[PDB]
Design a protein around this ligand. Structure first.
Ligand SMILES: *S(=O)(=O)c1cccc(S(=O)(=O)Nc2cc(C3=CCCC3)ccc2C(=O)NC)c1
Ligand SMILES: *S(=O)(=O)c1cccc(S(=O)(=O)Nc2cc(C3=CCCC3)ccc2C(=O)NC)c1
Ligand SMILES: [Cl-]
Lengths: 246, 236
């Protein structure tokens, strides 16, 4: 038996404008921060303990991790940030809202990019208003040209998240470390797809509740003894799960 | 040439009760958090950029670091925590206020402990109120039996802090990484003592301000080229 916990950050400041964030480093809204607090307090009430934490280089996830560590009195734990756990990169869509996206790129392309697993959105080009903000941010200075995405399908996202899982998180798990992972929807989807053997279709249909700790019981070979479970008040979990399915 | 920044955490909740905290994991008071916020604003206005951060395993220092990183938009930086940057362990005095310490231990011993570089306070014994709280905290589980103090003189604290400085932080500085250190007055004292070659008397005379970025400029031998400098408005 190993136990793994995941948490997906809540609402961001750009969610309130309905604009695509991707790699843009938007901060939690008051609501997103409350969600982090509630998840941390659920972990505390259940007495959960961790030995090492993994998050992205993006502050909505990092601040979610911080709030959780505060709530469970485990601020002293080692924390590891990696770009490989970042949100899916939304390319030229970054910063655009849905109406702007439709005007510029068409209903047809938007439908294709929405429903597809491996069709990326358009690249974020040097004239993009957020190009310098993201692609030239020094936190990616040590990425190789081939590693720095200009845009990402879900498949790209998963393909760059899973190596960090394999080479950095898995050995900690096998080292019996209790791992907490505070990241984003699409990188977490990579982890879930790998753990549970889900298809492209299922994983694209699987939305992870925000601010709800996701608990995995893994056997000796890191196979989920059961599918993901949700920690919290059973009524607020079903409500978030009905929200998410809707 | 090399630029090194230190910051001492601010007022804690046990400062408000005039209680010796030591290895007790007291949080910042609201005023102490505000101090860290102003220090961070000072760094942001100066345009300071870092590449790696070190702090202790105690939350008043960690939250000072978090506040600074938030203020300078560098929450993505790598952060390393180590017990070797902890505050002095105040053994039996942990949790006592000044009146309780006086009544229990006497003016004479209190004077000695306050004044001495190498005389530790009484050990924290198994019947001490905070014995389990600290000595059985799992964050120290990897420390050998001879590493987990029951009490520390200033000398002890500095002796256990400088190995982390020499084995981990000095390599980072020589790699060209811009280092931020968020810790505690006494553990920072060991870094300052070593950097400047201060005497026991002089380092006991040095009281580092709280919540203030302390800037060192170091030559290729990591020797300071001038006295430490402070960041912030001219008042502070
Ligand atoms: S992504 O999961 O981080 C994301 C950000 C904002 C909105 C959405 S959505 O709910 O899936 N709706 C949506 C997505 C997309 C694209 C996904 C891949 C690239 C573009 C296009 C249009 C829409 C939409 O529903 N507009 C009304 C996901
Ligand atoms: S330590 O630096 O974290 C610390 C905690 C509380 C008070 C002080 S003090 O300002 O130096 N005054 C003080 C210290 C001590 C001792 C230090 C070594 C062991 C005991 C004893 C008494 C006093 C004091 O001022 N009494 C009125 C430092
Ligand atoms: Cl951290």
């Amino acid at each position: 038996a190993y136990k793994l916990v995941l948490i997906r950050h809540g609402e961001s400041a750009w969610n309130l404008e309905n604009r695509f964030s991707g790699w843009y480093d938007a901060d939690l809204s008051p609501a997103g921060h409350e969600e982090a607090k509630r998840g941390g307090q659920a972990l505390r009430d259940a007495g959960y303990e961790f030995d090492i934490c993994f998050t992205s280089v993006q502050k909505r996830a990092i601040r979610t991790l911080w709030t959780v560590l505060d709530a469970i009195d485990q601020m002293w734990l080692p924390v590891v940030r990696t770009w490989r756990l970042n949100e899916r990169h939304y390319g030229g869509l970054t910063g655009l809202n849905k109406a702007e996206t439709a005007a510029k790129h068409g209903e047809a392309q938007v439908k294709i990019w929405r429903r597809s697993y491996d069709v990326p959105p358009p690249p974020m080009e040097p004239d993009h208003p957020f190009y310098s903000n993201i692609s030239k941010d020094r936190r990616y200075a040590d990425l190789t040209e081939d590693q720095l995405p200009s845009c990402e399908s879900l498949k790209d996202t998963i393909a760059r998240a899973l190596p960090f899982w394999n080479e950095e998180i898995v050995p900690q798990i096998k080292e019996g470390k209790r791992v907490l992972i505070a990241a984003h929807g699409n990188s977490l989807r990579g982890i879930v797809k790998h753990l549970e053997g889900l298809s492209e279709e299922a994983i694209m249909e699987l939305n992870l509740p925000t601010g709800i700790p996701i608990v995995y019981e893994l056997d000796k070979n890191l196979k989920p003894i059961k599918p993901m479970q949700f920690l919290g008040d059973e009524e607020t979990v079903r409500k978030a799960m009905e929200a998410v399915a809707a």
